[PDB]
Amino acid sequence: MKSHFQYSTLENIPKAFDILKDPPKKLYCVGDTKLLDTPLKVAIIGTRRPTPYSKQHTITLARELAKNGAVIVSGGALGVDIIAQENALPKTIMLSPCSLDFIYPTNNHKVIQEIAQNGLILSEYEKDFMPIKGSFLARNRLVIALSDVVIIPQADLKSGSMSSARLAQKYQKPLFVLPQRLNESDGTNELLEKGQAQGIFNIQNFINTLLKDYH
Amino acid sequence: MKSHFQYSTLENIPKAFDILKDPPKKLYCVGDTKLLDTPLKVAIIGTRRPTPYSKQHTITLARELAKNGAVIVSGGALGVDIIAQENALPKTIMLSPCSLDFIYPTNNHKVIQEIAQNGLILSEYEKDFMPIKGSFLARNRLVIALSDVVIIPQADLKSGSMSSARLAQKYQKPLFVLPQRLNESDGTNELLEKGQAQGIFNIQNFINTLLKDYHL
């Protein structure tokens, strides 16, 4: 699926990538590259199949933060990713697991089009490049490193969101998860039992605290 | 409603009550007083109207703890209390808000009767004393001071579970809650919010850890 994206290259790889053990040598971009300068970047990632409960609060989170000047970052994946990005428009950055001439995943072509138009997409791949196992993971570390804080509304064990969790750990990014009933979001509950993550027990409080610390 | 319980007076006020500001000077008992002499006592208290979700883990906790020699302590009220006490039998202790010649609430008379037979019921009140707004609260202090740990599976704000939660804090009893969605039980989520309580994110781990800390 061709995007028909007229995309350039980004002058300077942002400072945030410096922390990487294997930084990206070059980045391609489409849309507003001035979202890269913002005070607060929040990564919102998670399962491809969120419950109406997870979805509902992801929307609230993405919207509220975006409304108050935060920028949402994700991978455009089905589920939490795309839900969070679409509801943060225009203040949202996507890290693509494929080159900017393609659209992945194809099911989200609609929102990805709006992001390229109103937000920002970045790729570590020049052109005619499609996703393979290792390219998702590599895209992932970019989302985690670019962001100040990581929210994972819902996730299972041994998932990509757990990979990312481990990344948020070693890159000292604060990890936040939505409270979930036992057995409904194992991944996020394990992060909670291990103190590897902080719970969001009040949306208004979690967001206001976060704005105050940057703002 | 008469209980028709034959009951007595406890020989010794348990030491756990000395931490109270206003310890009870006499306690009345029916059932098995040797349940007072156990290593570990867990209060399980909460809303009268639990979700199937909260009921199911309340059940697992009461049963798995009782199975392994813990004693479950509660107040015999509708919902969480009675669910926990029924599932812990015979290892359960109830603190009654009325004298032991009465049964309250009447609808729990079946499980309360089983507790009188195989568990232990205690009361601050000698006889001819039916529950009043204040005997419920007085009874709550006895629940928290007797226990070593406190579990509140689910609860709303402005509730009795909440006045008890303060008591746990005031009396330094580690306080635990079930994971609950936003806007579902605001009392227990407020306790997580304010760092006043610890969440139970793995039932089996919570239980094994609890049993090992008390050498069971």
Coordinates of C-alpha atoms in Angstrom, one line a residue:
Chain A
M1 CA 0.0 0.0 0.0
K2 CA 1.6 3.2 -1.2
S3 CA 1.2 6.3 1.0
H4 CA 2.0 8.9 -1.8
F5 CA 3.8 10.7 1.0
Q6 CA 6.2 13.4 -0.2
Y7 CA 8.8 13.0 2.5
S8 CA 12.2 14.7 3.1
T9 CA 15.0 14.0 5.5
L10 CA 15.3 15.5 9.0
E11 CA 18.3 17.9 9.5
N12 CA 19.2 17.0 13.1
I13 CA 18.3 13.8 14.9
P14 CA 16.7 15.1 18.1
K15 CA 18.8 15.2 21.4
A16 CA 16.5 12.6 23.0
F17 CA 18.1 9.8 20.8
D18 CA 21.5 10.4 22.4
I19 CA 20.8 8.0 25.2
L20 CA 20.6 5.1 22.8
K21 CA 23.1 2.2 22.8
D22 CA 22.7 2.1 19.0
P23 CA 21.4 5.5 17.8
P24 CA 19.8 6.0 14.4
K25 CA 22.2 7.4 11.9
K26 CA 19.5 9.2 9.8
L27 CA 15.8 10.0 10.0
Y28 CA 13.2 10.6 7.3
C29 CA 10.2 12.7 8.1
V30 CA 6.8 13.9 6.9
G31 CA 4.7 16.6 8.5
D32 CA 5.4 19.2 11.3
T33 CA 9.0 18.7 12.5
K34 CA 8.4 21.4 15.1
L35 CA 6.5 18.9 17.4
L36 CA 10.1 17.6 18.0
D37 CA 10.9 20.7 20.1
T38 CA 8.1 20.3 22.6
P39 CA 8.5 20.4 26.4
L40 CA 6.5 17.2 27.0
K41 CA 6.4 14.0 25.0
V42 CA 4.2 11.1 26.2
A43 CA 4.5 7.7 24.7
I44 CA 1.2 5.7 24.7
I45 CA 1.6 2.1 23.7
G46 CA -0.2 -1.2 24.3
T47 CA -2.2 -4.2 23.1
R48 CA -3.6 -4.5 19.6
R49 CA -6.9 -5.5 21.3
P50 CA -7.8 -3.1 24.1
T51 CA -11.1 -3.5 26.1
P52 CA -13.7 -0.8 26.0
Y53 CA -12.4 0.1 29.4
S54 CA -8.8 0.5 28.3
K55 CA -9.8 2.3 25.1
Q56 CA -12.0 4.8 26.9
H57 CA -9.2 6.0 29.2
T58 CA -6.6 6.0 26.4
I59 CA -8.9 8.4 24.6
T60 CA -9.2 10.6 27.7
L61 CA -5.4 10.5 28.3
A62 CA -4.4 11.2 24.7
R63 CA -6.9 14.0 24.2
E64 CA -6.4 15.8 27.6
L65 CA -2.6 15.7 27.3
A66 CA -2.7 16.9 23.7
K67 CA -5.2 19.7 24.6
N68 CA -2.7 20.9 27.3
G69 CA 0.3 21.0 25.0
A70 CA 1.7 17.5 25.4
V71 CA 2.7 15.6 22.3
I72 CA 1.7 11.9 22.0
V73 CA 4.2 9.5 20.5
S74 CA 3.6 6.0 19.2
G75 CA 4.0 3.4 16.5
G76 CA 0.7 3.6 14.7
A77 CA 0.0 0.0 15.6
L78 CA -3.6 -1.4 15.7
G79 CA -5.2 -0.9 19.1
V80 CA -4.0 1.4 21.8
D81 CA -1.4 3.1 19.5
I82 CA -3.8 4.3 16.8
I83 CA -6.5 5.1 19.3
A84 CA -4.1 7.3 21.3
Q85 CA -2.6 8.9 18.2
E86 CA -5.9 9.7 16.5
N87 CA -7.3 11.3 19.7
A88 CA -4.2 13.5 20.1
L89 CA -4.4 15.1 16.6
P90 CA -2.8 17.3 15.7
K91 CA -0.2 17.0 18.5
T92 CA 1.1 13.5 17.8
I93 CA 4.3 11.8 16.5
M94 CA 4.4 8.4 14.9
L95 CA 7.5 6.2 14.6
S96 CA 7.1 4.0 11.5
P97 CA 8.4 0.4 11.3
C98 CA 8.5 0.8 7.5
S99 CA 9.7 3.5 5.1
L100 CA 7.6 6.6 4.6
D101 CA 6.5 5.6 1.1
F102 CA 4.6 2.7 2.6
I103 CA 1.7 2.6 5.1
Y104 CA 1.8 0.1 7.9
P105 CA -0.5 -1.2 9.2
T106 CA -2.8 -0.9 6.2
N107 CA -5.9 -1.0 8.4
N108 CA -5.0 2.3 9.9
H109 CA -4.4 4.0 6.6
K110 CA -7.0 6.6 7.5
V111 CA -5.5 7.9 10.7
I112 CA -1.9 7.6 9.4
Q113 CA -2.9 9.9 6.5
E114 CA -4.2 12.5 9.0
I115 CA -1.0 12.2 11.0
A116 CA 1.3 12.8 8.0
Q117 CA -0.9 15.8 7.2
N118 CA -1.3 17.3 10.6
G119 CA 1.3 15.7 12.9
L120 CA 4.6 14.0 12.3
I121 CA 5.8 10.6 11.0
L122 CA 9.4 9.5 11.3
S123 CA 11.2 6.5 9.8
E124 CA 14.7 5.0 10.1
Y125 CA 14.4 3.6 6.6
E126 CA 14.8 5.4 3.4
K127 CA 12.4 3.8 0.9
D128 CA 10.9 0.6 -0.4
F129 CA 11.4 -1.1 3.0
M130 CA 8.7 -3.3 4.6
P131 CA 8.6 -4.4 8.3
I132 CA 10.4 -7.5 9.6
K133 CA 10.5 -8.8 13.1
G134 CA 13.6 -6.8 14.1
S135 CA 12.3 -3.6 12.5
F136 CA 9.3 -3.4 14.9
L137 CA 11.6 -3.8 17.9
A138 CA 14.0 -1.2 16.5
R139 CA 11.1 1.3 15.8
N140 CA 10.1 0.6 19.4
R141 CA 13.3 1.8 21.1
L142 CA 12.9 5.1 19.1
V143 CA 9.4 5.6 20.6
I144 CA 10.7 5.0 24.1
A145 CA 13.8 7.1 23.8
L146 CA 12.0 10.0 22.1
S147 CA 9.5 10.2 24.9
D148 CA 9.8 11.6 28.5
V149 CA 7.1 9.4 30.0
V150 CA 5.6 6.0 28.9
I151 CA 1.9 5.0 29.4
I152 CA 0.8 1.4 28.8
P153 CA -3.0 1.3 29.3
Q154 CA -3.2 -2.5 28.9
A155 CA -0.9 -5.3 27.8
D156 CA -0.3 -9.1 28.1
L157 CA 2.8 -10.9 29.1
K158 CA 5.6 -11.7 26.7
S159 CA 4.3 -8.9 24.3
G160 CA 5.9 -6.0 22.5
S161 CA 4.6 -3.8 25.2
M162 CA 6.8 -5.8 27.7
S163 CA 9.8 -5.3 25.4
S164 CA 9.1 -1.6 25.5
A165 CA 8.7 -1.7 29.3
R166 CA 12.2 -3.2 29.6
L167 CA 13.3 -0.4 27.4
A168 CA 11.6 2.3 29.6
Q169 CA 13.5 0.7 32.5
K170 CA 17.0 0.8 31.2
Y171 CA 16.5 4.3 29.6
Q172 CA 15.1 5.6 32.9
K173 CA 11.7 6.7 31.5
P174 CA 8.9 6.7 34.1
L175 CA 6.4 3.9 33.4
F176 CA 2.7 4.4 34.0
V177 CA -0.2 1.8 33.6
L178 CA -3.9 1.9 34.0
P179 CA -5.4 0.0 36.9
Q180 CA -6.7 -3.3 35.6
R181 CA -8.6 -6.3 37.1
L182 CA -6.5 -9.4 37.8
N183 CA -6.2 -11.6 34.7
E184 CA -7.3 -8.9 32.3
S185 CA -3.9 -7.2 31.8
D186 CA -1.2 -9.4 33.0
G187 CA 1.7 -7.5 31.5
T188 CA 0.8 -4.3 33.3
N189 CA -0.1 -6.1 36.5
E190 CA 3.3 -7.7 36.6
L191 CA 5.0 -4.3 36.1
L192 CA 2.9 -3.2 39.1
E193 CA 3.7 -6.2 41.4
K194 CA 7.4 -5.7 40.6
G195 CA 7.3 -1.9 41.3
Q196 CA 8.6 -1.5 37.7
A197 CA 5.6 0.8 37.0
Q198 CA 3.4 3.4 38.6
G199 CA -0.5 3.2 38.6
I200 CA -2.8 6.0 37.4
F201 CA -5.4 6.0 40.1
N202 CA -6.8 9.3 39.1
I203 CA -6.8 10.6 35.5
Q204 CA -7.1 14.3 36.5
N205 CA -4.4 13.9 39.2
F206 CA -2.1 11.9 37.0
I207 CA -2.3 14.5 34.2
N208 CA -2.2 17.6 36.3
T209 CA 0.9 16.3 38.2
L210 CA 2.5 15.6 34.9
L211 CA 1.8 19.0 33.3
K212 CA 3.0 20.7 36.5
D213 CA 6.3 19.0 36.3
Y214 CA 6.9 20.2 32.7
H215 CA 4.4 23.0 31.7
Chain B
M1 CA -34.0 -12.2 65.9
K2 CA -32.8 -14.4 68.8
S3 CA -29.7 -16.4 68.2
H4 CA -30.4 -19.0 70.8
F5 CA -26.6 -19.1 71.4
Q6 CA -25.4 -20.3 74.7
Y7 CA -22.5 -18.0 75.3
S8 CA -19.9 -17.1 77.8
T9 CA -17.3 -14.5 78.8
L10 CA -13.7 -14.6 77.5
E11 CA -11.3 -15.3 80.4
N12 CA -8.6 -12.9 79.0
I13 CA -8.8 -9.8 76.8
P14 CA -6.5 -10.6 73.9
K15 CA -3.2 -8.6 73.9
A16 CA -3.8 -7.3 70.5
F17 CA -6.4 -4.9 72.0
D18 CA -3.9 -3.0 74.2
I19 CA -3.1 -0.8 71.2
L20 CA -6.6 0.5 71.5
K21 CA -7.3 3.9 73.0
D22 CA -10.5 2.5 74.5
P23 CA -9.9 -1.3 74.9
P24 CA -13.0 -3.4 75.7
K25 CA -13.0 -4.3 79.3
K26 CA -15.2 -7.5 78.8
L27 CA -15.7 -9.6 75.7
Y28 CA -18.4 -12.2 75.3
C29 CA -17.8 -15.3 73.3
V30 CA -19.4 -18.3 71.6
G31 CA -17.5 -21.0 69.8
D32 CA -13.8 -21.8 69.6
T33 CA -11.6 -19.4 71.7
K34 CA -8.4 -21.2 70.6
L35 CA -8.7 -19.4 67.2
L36 CA -7.4 -16.3 69.2
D37 CA -4.1 -18.2 69.7
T38 CA -3.0 -18.4 66.1
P39 CA 0.1 -16.9 64.4
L40 CA -1.7 -15.0 61.7
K41 CA -5.1 -13.2 61.6
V42 CA -6.4 -11.5 58.4
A43 CA -9.3 -9.1 58.4
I44 CA -11.3 -9.1 55.2
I45 CA -13.8 -6.3 55.1
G46 CA -15.6 -4.4 52.3
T47 CA -18.7 -3.3 50.5
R48 CA -22.1 -5.0 51.0
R49 CA -22.6 -5.1 47.3
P50 CA -19.5 -6.6 45.6
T51 CA -19.0 -7.3 41.9
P52 CA -18.7 -10.9 40.8
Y53 CA -15.1 -9.8 40.3
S54 CA -14.6 -8.8 43.9
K55 CA -16.5 -11.8 45.2
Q56 CA -14.4 -14.2 43.3
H57 CA -11.1 -13.1 44.6
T58 CA -12.5 -12.5 48.1
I59 CA -13.5 -16.2 48.0
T60 CA -10.0 -17.3 46.8
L61 CA -8.3 -15.3 49.5
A62 CA -10.5 -16.4 52.4
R63 CA -10.3 -20.1 51.3
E64 CA -6.7 -20.3 50.5
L65 CA -5.7 -18.4 53.7
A66 CA -7.9 -20.5 55.9
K67 CA -6.7 -23.6 54.2
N68 CA -3.2 -22.8 55.3
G69 CA -3.8 -22.0 58.9
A70 CA -4.6 -18.3 58.8
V71 CA -7.7 -17.1 60.6
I72 CA -10.1 -14.8 58.8
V73 CA -11.6 -11.9 60.9
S74 CA -14.6 -9.9 59.9
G75 CA -17.9 -8.4 60.9
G76 CA -20.5 -10.7 59.5
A77 CA -22.1 -8.0 57.4
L78 CA -23.7 -8.4 54.0
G79 CA -21.4 -8.8 51.0
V80 CA -17.6 -9.0 51.4
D81 CA -17.6 -9.8 55.2
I82 CA -20.0 -12.7 55.1
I83 CA -18.6 -14.0 51.8
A84 CA -15.1 -14.2 53.4
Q85 CA -16.3 -15.7 56.7
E86 CA -18.3 -18.4 55.0
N87 CA -15.4 -19.4 52.8
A88 CA -12.9 -19.5 55.7
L89 CA -14.9 -21.7 58.0
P90 CA -14.1 -23.1 60.4
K91 CA -11.1 -20.7 60.6
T92 CA -12.9 -17.5 61.2
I93 CA -13.7 -14.9 63.8
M94 CA -16.6 -12.5 63.8
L95 CA -16.9 -9.3 65.8
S96 CA -20.6 -8.6 66.3
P97 CA -22.2 -5.2 66.5
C98 CA -24.8 -6.5 68.9
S99 CA -25.0 -8.8 72.0
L100 CA -24.6 -12.5 71.3
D101 CA -28.2 -13.3 72.1
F102 CA -29.2 -11.6 68.8
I103 CA -28.3 -12.3 65.2
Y104 CA -27.5 -9.4 62.9
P105 CA -28.1 -9.0 60.0
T106 CA -31.0 -11.6 60.1
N107 CA -30.4 -12.6 56.5
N108 CA -26.9 -13.9 57.4
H109 CA -28.3 -16.1 60.2
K110 CA -27.2 -19.3 58.4
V111 CA -23.5 -18.5 58.1
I112 CA -23.4 -16.7 61.4
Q113 CA -24.9 -19.9 63.0
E114 CA -22.2 -22.0 61.4
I115 CA -19.6 -19.6 62.8
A116 CA -21.0 -19.9 66.3
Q117 CA -20.7 -23.7 66.0
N118 CA -17.3 -24.0 64.3
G119 CA -15.7 -20.6 64.4
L120 CA -15.8 -17.9 67.1
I121 CA -18.0 -14.9 67.6
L122 CA -17.2 -12.1 70.0
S123 CA -19.1 -9.1 71.3
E124 CA -18.5 -6.0 73.5
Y125 CA -22.1 -6.2 74.5
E126 CA -23.5 -8.6 77.2
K127 CA -27.2 -9.0 76.4
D128 CA -30.4 -7.2 75.3
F129 CA -28.3 -5.0 73.0
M130 CA -29.4 -4.5 69.4
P131 CA -27.2 -2.7 66.9
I132 CA -27.1 1.1 66.8
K133 CA -25.2 3.4 64.4
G134 CA -22.3 3.5 66.9
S135 CA -22.0 -0.2 67.8
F136 CA -21.0 -0.8 64.2
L137 CA -18.1 1.6 64.4
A138 CA -17.0 0.4 67.8
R139 CA -17.0 -3.2 66.5
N140 CA -14.9 -2.2 63.5
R141 CA -12.1 -1.0 65.8
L142 CA -12.1 -4.5 67.3
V143 CA -11.8 -6.1 63.9
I144 CA -8.8 -4.0 62.9
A145 CA -6.9 -4.2 66.3
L146 CA -7.3 -8.0 66.5
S147 CA -5.9 -8.5 63.0
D148 CA -2.3 -8.5 61.8
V149 CA -3.2 -7.6 58.2
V150 CA -6.2 -5.9 56.5
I151 CA -7.6 -6.8 53.1
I152 CA -10.3 -4.6 51.5
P153 CA -11.3 -6.3 48.2
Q154 CA -13.6 -3.5 47.2
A155 CA -15.2 -0.4 48.8
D156 CA -16.6 3.0 48.0
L157 CA -15.7 6.5 49.4
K158 CA -17.4 7.7 52.6
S159 CA -17.9 4.1 53.7
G160 CA -17.3 2.0 56.8
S161 CA -14.5 0.2 55.0
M162 CA -12.9 3.6 54.9
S163 CA -13.3 4.6 58.5
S164 CA -11.7 1.1 59.1
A165 CA -8.9 1.9 56.6
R166 CA -7.9 4.9 58.8
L167 CA -8.0 2.5 61.9
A168 CA -5.5 0.2 60.1
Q169 CA -3.3 3.2 59.5
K170 CA -3.7 4.6 63.0
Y171 CA -3.0 1.1 64.4
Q172 CA -0.2 0.3 61.9
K173 CA -1.7 -2.7 60.3
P174 CA -0.5 -3.3 56.7
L175 CA -3.5 -2.7 54.4
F176 CA -4.0 -4.5 51.1
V177 CA -6.6 -4.0 48.3
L178 CA -7.7 -5.8 45.1
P179 CA -6.8 -4.2 41.8
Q180 CA -9.9 -2.3 40.6
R181 CA -10.7 -0.3 37.5
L182 CA -11.1 3.5 37.6
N183 CA -14.4 4.7 39.0
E184 CA -15.3 1.3 40.3
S185 CA -14.3 1.3 44.0
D186 CA -13.1 4.8 44.7
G187 CA -12.3 4.0 48.3
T188 CA -9.7 1.3 47.6
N189 CA -8.3 3.3 44.6
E190 CA -7.9 6.4 46.8
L191 CA -5.9 4.2 49.2
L192 CA -3.6 3.2 46.4
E193 CA -3.5 6.8 45.2
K194 CA -2.4 8.1 48.6
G195 CA 0.2 5.4 49.1
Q196 CA -1.9 4.2 52.2
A197 CA -2.5 0.7 50.8
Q198 CA -0.6 -1.9 48.8
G199 CA -2.3 -3.6 45.8
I200 CA -2.7 -7.4 45.4
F201 CA -1.4 -7.9 41.9
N202 CA -0.8 -11.6 42.3
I203 CA -3.2 -13.6 44.6
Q204 CA -1.0 -16.7 44.9
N205 CA 2.2 -14.6 45.5
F206 CA 0.5 -12.3 48.0
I207 CA -0.7 -15.4 49.8
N208 CA 2.6 -17.4 49.8
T209 CA 4.4 -14.3 50.9
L210 CA 1.9 -13.7 53.7
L211 CA 2.1 -17.3 54.9
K212 CA 5.9 -17.2 54.9
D213 CA 6.2 -13.9 56.8
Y214 CA 4.2 -15.5 59.6
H215 CA 6.0 -18.8 59.4
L216 CA 3.2 -21.0 58.2

